[PDB]
Scaffold this active site. Structure first.
Site, mmCIF file in Angstrom:
data_model
loop_
_atom_site.group_PDB
_atom_site.id
_atom_site.type_symbol
_atom_site.label_atom_id
_atom_site.label_comp_id
_atom_site.label_asym_id
_atom_site.label_seq_id
_atom_site.Cartn_x
_atom_site.Cartn_y
_atom_site.Cartn_z
ATOM 1 N N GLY B 288 57.338 60.119 42.041
ATOM 2 C CA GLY B 288 57.485 61.230 41.098
ATOM 3 C C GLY B 288 56.145 61.692 40.530
ATOM 4 N N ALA B 289 55.329 60.728 40.143
ATOM 5 C CA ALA B 289 54.062 61.023 39.473
ATOM 6 C C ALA B 289 53.297 59.699 39.356
ATOM 7 C CB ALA B 289 54.328 61.603 38.086
ATOM 8 N N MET B 290 52.071 59.732 38.825
ATOM 9 C CA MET B 290 51.308 58.485 38.594
ATOM 10 C C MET B 290 50.363 58.713 37.401
ATOM 11 S SD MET B 290 50.632 55.407 39.031
ATOM 12 C CE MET B 290 49.335 54.530 38.111
ATOM 13 N N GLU B 291 50.331 57.753 36.474
ATOM 14 C CA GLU B 291 49.789 57.995 35.123
ATOM 15 C C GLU B 291 48.261 57.849 34.985
ATOM 16 O OE1 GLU B 291 52.078 55.374 35.865
ATOM 17 O OE2 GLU B 291 51.271 53.516 34.928
ATOM 18 N N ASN B 292 47.516 58.144 36.055
ATOM 19 C CA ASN B 292 46.066 57.914 36.036
ATOM 20 C C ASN B 292 45.441 58.442 34.759
ATOM 21 O OD1 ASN B 292 46.251 57.199 39.033
ATOM 22 N ND2 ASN B 292 46.684 59.413 39.074
ATOM 23 N N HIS B 324 57.333 60.658 30.538
ATOM 24 C CA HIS B 324 57.182 59.302 31.053
ATOM 25 C C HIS B 324 55.694 59.050 31.336
ATOM 26 C CE1 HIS B 324 58.616 55.783 33.579
ATOM 27 N NE2 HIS B 324 57.373 55.933 34.009
ATOM 28 N N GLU B 325 55.040 59.998 32.021
ATOM 29 C CA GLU B 325 53.620 59.819 32.351
ATOM 30 C C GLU B 325 52.764 59.707 31.073
ATOM 31 O OE1 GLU B 325 52.739 59.142 35.557
ATOM 32 O OE2 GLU B 325 54.885 59.200 35.552
ATOM 33 N N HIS B 328 52.937 56.424 29.256
ATOM 34 C CA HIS B 328 52.052 55.429 29.868
ATOM 35 C C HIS B 328 50.613 55.461 29.320
ATOM 36 C CE1 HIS B 328 54.349 53.339 32.906
ATOM 37 N NE2 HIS B 328 54.589 54.426 33.628
ATOM 38 N N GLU B 347 56.577 49.795 32.393
ATOM 39 C CA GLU B 347 57.615 50.698 32.946
ATOM 40 C C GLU B 347 58.871 50.800 32.093
ATOM 41 O OE1 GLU B 347 56.867 52.836 34.968
ATOM 42 O OE2 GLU B 347 55.034 51.994 35.882
HETATM 43 C C1 LIG Z 1 58.723 59.221 36.902
HETATM 44 C C2 LIG Z 1 58.128 57.855 37.293
HETATM 45 C C3 LIG Z 1 59.197 56.952 37.864
HETATM 46 C C4 LIG Z 1 56.917 58.014 38.216
HETATM 47 C C5 LIG Z 1 56.025 56.821 38.452
HETATM 48 N N1 LIG Z 1 56.609 55.960 39.488
HETATM 49 C C6 LIG Z 1 55.914 54.816 40.015
HETATM 50 O O1 LIG Z 1 54.807 54.537 39.591
HETATM 51 C C7 LIG Z 1 56.612 53.984 41.096
HETATM 52 O O2 LIG Z 1 57.563 54.839 41.724
HETATM 53 C C8 LIG Z 1 55.649 53.423 42.123
HETATM 54 N N2 LIG Z 1 54.997 54.457 42.866
HETATM 55 C C9 LIG Z 1 56.366 52.477 43.088
HETATM 56 C C10 LIG Z 1 55.427 51.736 44.064
HETATM 57 C C11 LIG Z 1 54.481 50.815 43.577
HETATM 58 C C12 LIG Z 1 53.620 50.154 44.454
HETATM 59 C C13 LIG Z 1 53.718 50.435 45.818
HETATM 60 C C14 LIG Z 1 54.667 51.334 46.319
HETATM 61 C C15 LIG Z 1 55.515 51.999 45.430
HETATM 62 C C16 LIG Z 1 55.841 56.059 37.150
HETATM 63 O O3 LIG Z 1 55.161 56.568 36.248
HETATM 64 O O4 LIG Z 1 56.396 54.940 36.930
HETATM 65 ZN ZN LIG Z 2 56.151 54.619 34.956
#
Ligand SMILES: CC(C)C[C@H](NC(=O)[C@@H](O)[C@H](N)Cc1ccccc1)C(=O)O
Ligand SMILES: [Zn+2]
Ligand SMILES: *[C@@H]1O[C@H](CO)[C@@H](O[C@@H]2O[C@H](CO)[C@@H](O[C@@H]3O[C@H](CO)[C@@H](O)[C@H](O)[C@@H]3O)[C@H](O)[C@H]2NC(C)=O)[C@H](O)[C@H]1NC(C)=O
Ligand SMILES: *[C@@H]1O[C@H](CO)[C@@H](O[C@@H]2O[C@H](CO)[C@@H](O[C@@H]3O[C@H](CO)[C@@H](O)[C@H](O)[C@@H]3O)[C@H](O)[C@H]2NC(C)=O)[C@H](O)[C@H]1NC(C)=O
Ligand SMILES: CC(C)C[C@H](NC(=O)[C@@H](O)[C@H](N)Cc1ccccc1)C(=O)O
Ligand SMILES: *[C@@H]1O[C@H](CO)[C@@H](O)[C@H](O)[C@H]1NC(C)=O
Ligand SMILES: *[C@@H]1O[C@H](CO)[C@@H](O)[C@H](O)[C@H]1NC(C)=O
Ligand SMILES: *[C@@H]1O[C@H](CO)[C@@H](O)[C@H](O)[C@H]1NC(C)=O
Ligand SMILES: *[C@@H]1O[C@H](CO)[C@@H](O)[C@H](O)[C@H]1NC(C)=O
Ligand SMILES: *[C@@H]1O[C@H](CO)[C@@H](O)[C@H](O)[C@H]1NC(C)=O
Ligand SMILES: *[C@@H]1O[C@H](CO)[C@@H](O)[C@H](O)[C@H]1NC(C)=O
Ligand SMILES: *[C@@H]1O[C@H](CO)[C@@H](O)[C@H](O)[C@H]1NC(C)=O
Ligand SMILES: *[C@@H]1O[C@H](CO)[C@@H](O)[C@H](O)[C@H]1NC(C)=O
Ligand SMILES: [Zn+2]
Lengths: 903, 903
Positions: B288-292, B324-325, B328, B347
């Site tokens: 979905g996204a990643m919180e860098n 959510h992002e 984080h 999480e």
């Molecule tokens: C809206 C949110 C769920 C988006 C984001 N999602 C994630 O970080 C997870 O889906 C991770 N991308 C799952 C993952 C971790 C390590 C290797 C392969 C896959 C998050 O911020 O947790």
């Molecule tokens: Zn998350």
């Protein structure tokens, strides 16, 4: 078990040979306290000792013996012989014997009698002496009836139960006084009351001719009949449930039976020797019919006919099955196979001769022609495998009842018929029937092997001074003792021909050796630009003759009307001339040869002998073909494409192509029938019409979908006034159910449950398998297994209809893998065979995944064994391996061809 | 490998700890001669030796090193330290290390620097530094972008890649002069031309805060942006492909991002410390996204929004994912998990706090309520298995990247959120947020374990003089260190409560021991005839209190608004009073508790704690329920019934029942929307409408089938004027394709291929899996695997949509069994997970046959291993065994219930 003991070996000893038997049987048609239906009987067999022995080995299956004088049987002398005392008896279950161990040896060339008293279950297992049931209103009617073929006479009384152990039989039936007893012969004198209980009658029958045990019949019912003395003086009666007879549904059988019997008696110059031939239709019966001498039994759908509700196809089934049964009175009953390995002497003959008889009765139908589709092309599919088998299998390989049952197959029936059709063609039927008359006269009341037939045909050839390239035996041994058939390849540039064993898979392993080297002696007929040429005999692997050379615009075709059991390939230039002819004027090529060109090319393509696009190009002309046969041959060959591709991207374009090809024909019929109000006059045109509707609807012609759903809806609104002509019902019902939902399905199921016509029930039963909803197919599968809902005789037929549906494929295969043990117990042995089911569930397999499941299925069930489905499993493994490779090689070119040619 | 060597163990040694890094990366966005996209880089890491060691073990994955001074790296002193010479280096692939073997030992409490020069592939594998691609007209645009979570920073530069190895990072990106470089921080001074080639710019960024490697981001693109300074002075930019920004599709994100950031800063009394927070949407992105930190990345469907074509559900997805992002930035970035076993600290918090933020931005939507469905009930399905896992797994069990990836699951996210929702409820959010402020202040720029959280919440409890039955730690350890949750069973005759660990299968084996004995300390809220009672704490396995006793007509319900992570059962008399209330006036029970009664009873039935007819009886009132939530809870529970029964006789009656129950609601919406011209004002009512349409059409309401097929046909006739409101598109597209044929499918596929809106492509992609034709599903399966047709990021999502279709079940399961090795290579590791696919393909299994296939699949692939799908396979085996038994126990009663109640 110890193979050194004769009672552990499957073939009877040659030490004893029966002369005659008396048998008394008493079925109890109401259950006992235990809830069992039983029969009680006694028998005396008189037999001759041929070589001194201290044991009497006789067949016995599921019989319980009443002790007499201290043992299971009593052994008495005849003509002053003095038999030893009995030591003990045993029942040996695997080989199905009663074994009588004696305190001394019997004397060579002396006679003895053995007396037995026994009881068996009158089971609803369609085998031996068994029960059939029907309802008349709310009254349960129970019928005692028989099916001995092949090895079940022994399940009714102890007997030397092999077909060359011929004897006379003296039958007495003890039965409720209100019910009619029937057997092979007429009653001997009056029926008398049973002394112990005058509610029962005792009915003795006249002695039979010398005959085989598998042809005996014993029936007790309250059936009614219609009757007519045939022109040869034989009395014919058609017997069935009273309501069917009263409704007139036995009338068509009465119209055809006597005349066909008389026709065969004339044609073969050999009288039918018995005073009567009864035809009787049973509610529970595990085959089309059975040729019991004097008392021919039928399932209802093969004997009864309702002019207001049965289709023309149903009517054709009745006349051809009657003809087949009557053919057996000569080929099987009067003259009998020595042993089951030569079964085609019975079944090949009946399968061929049936058309002669049916054609006699219905000369306007042109049925003889259908042999090309129903015999030649039907069997060539399996006879192109390395796991096929010769027409005459070595006798020493056929021993168990499973191995015997397995031979009742397309080889013994359809290849038998095809080879006889070929033989009749090269001899002429006049010479053929002359040799047959001699064969029948010489071996009347005796048993034959294939060599006996050749000897008598040779006699006719020699009398007529017919010149052949060698003896009948040497020509015909090539077609009889080795499996398979040749492809004849013509090079029209040079006029060269060559032959090789035709194998659908080039990479398949022929393990059965042939002393004939898979080389045939082949009678070759041919046409050049439509004119028949001089005949030719190909005696070698290759030859040259100007008959087969062309120049300029000329084309040649071999195998006029496909009289010969062989496929033909040509150089690509001659194929192109043939395709040009089909575009210019397809009527210039004989109709059967239009079917040939299509069917041969598709099979050649599978075998990698022509490009697949050549075979597909041969279907292009069908857009203006109106004849039944070429369309049917194309649909039959394209069935393989459907099985290979109906779970793939290729299927859309395939359906698009068939839609395009059939639409003008569908529209022609819509117009010609005055919008489905009438049916065509000609039988083949009626069949063409049905195929046009079926093909149009299956492949998405919108006018067809609207038509069938409209008619079915109109029926639902008026259940007792069915507006669908009988010829159209199968296809309308199936396609209306496929297009519809739960409401259409439930309506058809209720119509099925309430059916009073067997032809109508059958069409509904097949149609119900056309649902596209997986949950509905699963529910239906559960019904097929419930004998209160679908008759046991119809269970596997209905399961096959489900697996033919693409959505039913996974369902039925997973079901068969999961339930093999129980299924094998219930529908795999006795009167039943699982061969058709194995063939049907596996024919879509085209993936390594499916192959692995099939291999695992074999391994997992090796101990249960596969009985009469053993060869079908070996064939399925071979075909699956060939299919994986064929799909890999062909999927892209076929996708592209259907896409590029469907627009 | 030899476990005695540190370089063969998965956790880094504790001997070395980094201080700061500089990294220069140069992506090449055109292929080289070999056709490879590459990046070149250099790095210096400064680190402290914490204990004397003769080896430097640092993470490195798929990097090739340029030799410098005779070795893969150069090691230098700092502050006068004098490092040993390098002996040799090795790359150890399983543990993903560069290992630098030294000729002597480093000195404790001294610093050193290590310099590296390296090259990697800029692969299209969505992991590390990778490439994303899109088309603008016929011009291929290539973007260099990153995804480090969890263990892929090491795939971009050598680093001590564990989250507690925090450091400052000094990033330089070298890039084409026309493209913008972006990273966590703002640029440090101007970009300068690269001396060797002025077609490139060199862009250095300011030093990052102390932070974890998994939060670094490096992006080079020609994206455009919109921008706004937030009220806390932080600059927000929304970056996306130029056409999306120009179309205004970043505008909603800009409306919500800054305000939510400022809201969280206020709520937690903790400033966001960075000068900016960029949000950027990537065409190729595996989550979905990643919180860098400073550069939050999104897939396009989670950031962009088109008011004229996106649905209300899409809009809700954007605000909640942004929330959510941003959550984080506090819970994950500022304060970080010590190690992945405690992932829920990141999480669980983001999953809970997202609703607070989204509710701030959209106060009229009432989103906080959806936690009951999206969190509590989502996770209870898996947390009722013996093969679930605790919120906090022992750290020593989590070692490999597969084991880490596997923890990103419903436990860490949704159970984490549910437990925090419960905690906030019993503390009050005022006390909760006070303890959180203290936690964040104390551990800013550091790492935490679960005990650190309890300590700070305790501090707030103690300050407020809140009295609890014990310490926060002891209450919460019960919910954190053991798996599962209790069912609380009430006997309203006596007022007794008792708890036990809730297991969906009674005969399943709990093998993971609990020092807590699967006994919880449970905060219990309750209502009596709709009036809230005093709270209660259940501290023991059983207790008695008059709060839970009733007499006369009174009913009680526990767990008001399902704030607590537990299920509730009652004596059958109280259940009957509840069912009477639902018939009399269902509005007397809070809406969330109507969902609870339904969902709890269905799960209790599976567990054999109530009769299945009790759970089915609880759905009867739905015929007059208009609220979204109780319907959604019912449909979610009945999903299980569909999976168990949609290949069985039970399915007709089930569909008949749902048809009956939903028809009045469907008709209500038809009328209220003025025949689908309008949508409801209230968000939950909009969702209720969509569910009524979906349910009506799936179960055969004819007005629904006509409606959707009509609308889709109208669209086909006017492709550029879509007449279907965005809210209705998913369900209209799916049901029109299901009702239609090849023509509808092909139209939707062309619309998909030509899509310019990601929300629109997604709806079509799901809809295409609704075909009932097996050949079409097979063809579609082949498309999902072709990255030119379906983006790699969407391959497994689409395969799951196919397997959810009853006709796709066999297809996809056979495909997965046949192709496991190749599938595992492509979509099972790195940024990908196969966990969802294993769960989806196996959830229908309810037969011994399917169980045997699953067991064989495990055996056959044990060596390949199952990586991050390992626990999903163990769960599938457990559920399948439970399903076989449940179907046996329930199929007849369920068939009868649906039949008797659907009329
Ligand atoms: C809206 C949110 C769920 C988006 C984001 N999602 C994630 O970080 C997870 O889906 C991770 N991308 C799952 C993952 C971790 C390590 C290797 C392969 C896959 C998050 O911020 O947790
Ligand atoms: Zn998350
Ligand atoms: C089945 O019924 C037939 C016909 O009734 C029985 O055949 C008859 O058997 C008797 C007694 O064996 C024959 O008479 C005898 O013939 C022998 C020559 O083998 C002679 O030596 C005796 O003096 C005596 O006359 C009779 O000819 C014969 N009838 C016919 C038409 O063949 C047969 O025995 C019955 N079989 C059983 C097992 O009941
Ligand atoms: C990443 O960039 C930062 C910020 O520019 C660098 O931090 C700076 O590092 C220098 C050199 O170590 C520091 O100066 C020195 O401080 C030490 C005390 O440790 C002192 O003994 C020396 O005399 C010298 O003054 C400087 O203070 C520091 N700046 C900040 C703001 O912390 C860091 O080194 C970079 N890291 C890498 C690997 O490039
Ligand atoms: C129309 C005919 C095919 C009818 C009839 N058919 C048969 O005899 C065969 O179908 C046999 N009933 C097949 C068979 C033999 C042994 C054990 C189980 C099954 C026949 O006369 O050959
Ligand atoms: C034959 O005997 C067996 C063994 O006692 C018995 O179970 C079976 O029912 C008997 N058959 C009949 C028809 O009585
Ligand atoms: C049987 O023949 C009679 C007399 O020719 C005929 O009227 C009748 O229609 C025939 N029955 C059938 C079913 O063809
Ligand atoms: C052949 O001719 C001989 C001599 O006339 C005759 O007796 C015999 O029946 C004939 N055989 C055949 C098969 O026609
Ligand atoms: C099939 O016909 C097409 C079109 O006329 C032709 O191009 C192709 O060669 C034909 N295939 C073969 C095998 O002759
Ligand atoms: C790294 O080196 C390997 C082995 O020589 C080579 O195959 C690969 O292409 C290299 N990677 C890059 C990005 O150059
Ligand atoms: C963003 O806010 C502006 C100003 O209030 C508003 O006009 C616009 O509709 C909003 N955008 C969305 C997608 O809601
Ligand atoms: C508790 O109160 C102390 C004393 O005033 C204060 O310093 C501390 O910040 C408070 N802690 C929490 C968690 O509120
Ligand atoms: C479900 O309701 C029916 C009909 O009112 C009732 O007979 C049955 O007992 C109920 N089931 C349970 C478990 O209470
Ligand atoms: Zn026959």
């Amino acid at each position: 078990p110890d193979q050194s003991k004769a009672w552990n070996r499957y073939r009877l000893p040659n030490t004893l040979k029966p002369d005659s038997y008396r048998v008394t049987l008493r079925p109890y048609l109401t259950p006992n306290d235990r809830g069992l239906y039983v029969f009680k009987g006694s028998s005396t067999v008189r037999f001759t000792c041929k070589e001194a022995t201290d044991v009497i080995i006789i067949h016995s299956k599921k019989l319980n013996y009443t002790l007499s004088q201290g043992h299971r049987v009593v052994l008495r002398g005849v003509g002053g012989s003095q038999p030893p005392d009995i030591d003990k008896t045993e029942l040996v279950e695997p080989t199905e014997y009663l074994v009588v161990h004696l305190k001394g040896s019997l004397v060579k060339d002396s006679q003895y009698e053995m007396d037995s008293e026994f009881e068996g279950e009158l089971a609803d297992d369609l085998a031996g002496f068994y029960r059939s049931e029907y309802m008349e209103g709310n009254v349960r009617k129970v019928v005692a009836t028989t099916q001995m073929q092949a090895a079940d006479a022994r399940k009714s009384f102890p007997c030397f139960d092999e077909p060359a152990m011929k004897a006379e039989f003296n039958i007495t039936l003890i039965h409720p006084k209100d019910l009619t007893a029937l057997s092979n012969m007429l009653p001997k004198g009056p029926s008398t009351p049973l002394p112990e209980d005058p509610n029962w009658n005792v009915t003795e029958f006249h002695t039979t001719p010398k005959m085989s045990t598998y042809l005996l019949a014993f029936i007790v019912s309250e059936f009614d009949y219609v009757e007519k003395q045939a022109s040869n003086g034989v009395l014919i009666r058609i017997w069935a449930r009273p309501s069917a007879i009263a409704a007139g549904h036995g009338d068509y059988a009465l119209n055809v039976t006597g005349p066909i019997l008389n026709f065969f008696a004339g044609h073969y110059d050999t009288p039918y020797p018995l005073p009567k031939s009864d035809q009787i239709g049973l509610p529970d019966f595990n085959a089309g019919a059975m040729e019991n001498w004097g008392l021919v039994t039928y399932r209802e759908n093969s004997l009864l006919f309702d002019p207001l509700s049965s289709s023309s196809s149903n009517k054709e089934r009745v006349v051809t099955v009657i003809a087949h049964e009557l053919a057996h009175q000569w080929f099987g009953n009067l003259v009998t196979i020595e042993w089951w390995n030569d079964l085609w002497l019975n079944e090949g003959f009946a399968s061929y001769v049936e058309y002669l008889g049916a054609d006699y009765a219905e000369p306007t139908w042109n049925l003889k022609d259908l042999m090309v589709l129903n015999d030649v092309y039907r069997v060539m599919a399996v006879d192109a495998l390395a796991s096929s088998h010769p027409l005459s299998t070595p006798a020493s390989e056929i021993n168990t009842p499973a191995q015997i049952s397995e031979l009742f197959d397309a080889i013994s029936y359809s290849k038998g018929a095809s080879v006889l059709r070929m033989l009749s063609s090269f001899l002429s039927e006049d010479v053929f029937k002359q040799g047959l008359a001699s064969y029948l006269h010489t071996f009347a009341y005796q048993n034959t092997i294939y060599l006996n037939l050749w000897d008598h045909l040779q006699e006719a050839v020699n009398n007529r001074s017919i010149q052949l390239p060698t003896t009948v035996r040497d020509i015909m041994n090539r077609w009889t003792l080795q499996m398979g058939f040749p492809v004849i390849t013509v090079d029209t540039s040079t006029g060269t021909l060559s032959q090789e064993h035709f194998l659908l898979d080039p990479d398949s392993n022929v393990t059965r050796p042939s002393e004939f080297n898979y080389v045939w002696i082949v009678p070759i007929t041919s046409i050049r630009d439509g004119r028949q040429q001089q005949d030719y005999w190909l005696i070698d692997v290759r030859a040259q003759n100007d008959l087969f050379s062309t120049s300029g615009n000329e084309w040649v075709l071999l195998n006029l009307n496909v009289t010969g059991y062989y496929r033909v390939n040509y150089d690509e230039e001659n194929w192109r001339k043939i395709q040009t002819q089909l575009q210019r004027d397809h009527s210039a090529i004989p109709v059967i040869n239009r079917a040939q060109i299509i069917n041969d090319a598709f099979n050649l393509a599978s075998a990698h002998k022509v490009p697949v696009t050549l075979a597909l190009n041969n279907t292009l002309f069908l857009i203006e073909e109106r004849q039944y046969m070429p369309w049917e041959a194309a649909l039959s060959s394209l069935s393989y494409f459907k099985l290979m591709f109906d779970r793939s991207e290729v299927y859309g374009p395939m359906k698009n192509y068939l839609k395009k090809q059939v639409t003008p024909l569908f529209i022609h019929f819509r117009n010609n029938t005055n919008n489905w109000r009438e049916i065509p006059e000609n039988l083949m045109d009626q069949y063409s019409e049905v195929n046009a509707i079926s093909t149009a609807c299956s492949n998405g012609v919108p006018e067809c979908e609207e038509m069938v759903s409209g008619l079915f809806k109109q029926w639902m609104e008026n259940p007792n006034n069915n507006p669908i002509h009988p010829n159209l019902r199968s296809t309308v019902y199936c396609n209306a159910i496929a297009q519809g939902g739960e409401e259409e399905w439930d309506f058809a199921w209720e119509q099925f449950r309430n059916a009073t016509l067997v032809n109508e029930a059958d069409k509904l039963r097949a149609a119900l398998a056309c649902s596209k909803e997986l949950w509905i197919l699963n529910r239906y599968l559960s019904y097929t297994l419930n004998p209160d809902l679908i008759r046991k005789q119809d269970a596997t037929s209905t399961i096959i209809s489900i697996t033919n549906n693409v959505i039913g494929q996974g369902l039925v295969w997973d079901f068969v893998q999961s339930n093999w043990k129980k299924l094998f117990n219930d529908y795999g042995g006795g009167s039943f065979s699982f061969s058709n089911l194995i063939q049907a569930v596996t024919r879509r397999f085209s993936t390594e995944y499916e192959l692995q499941q099939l291999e695992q299925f074999k391994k997992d069930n090796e101990e249960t064994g596969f009985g009469s489905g053993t060869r079908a499993l070996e064939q399925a493994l071979e075909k699956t391996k060939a299919n994986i490779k064929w799909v890999k090689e062909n999927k892209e070119v076929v996708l592209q061809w259907f896409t590029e040619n469907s627009k």
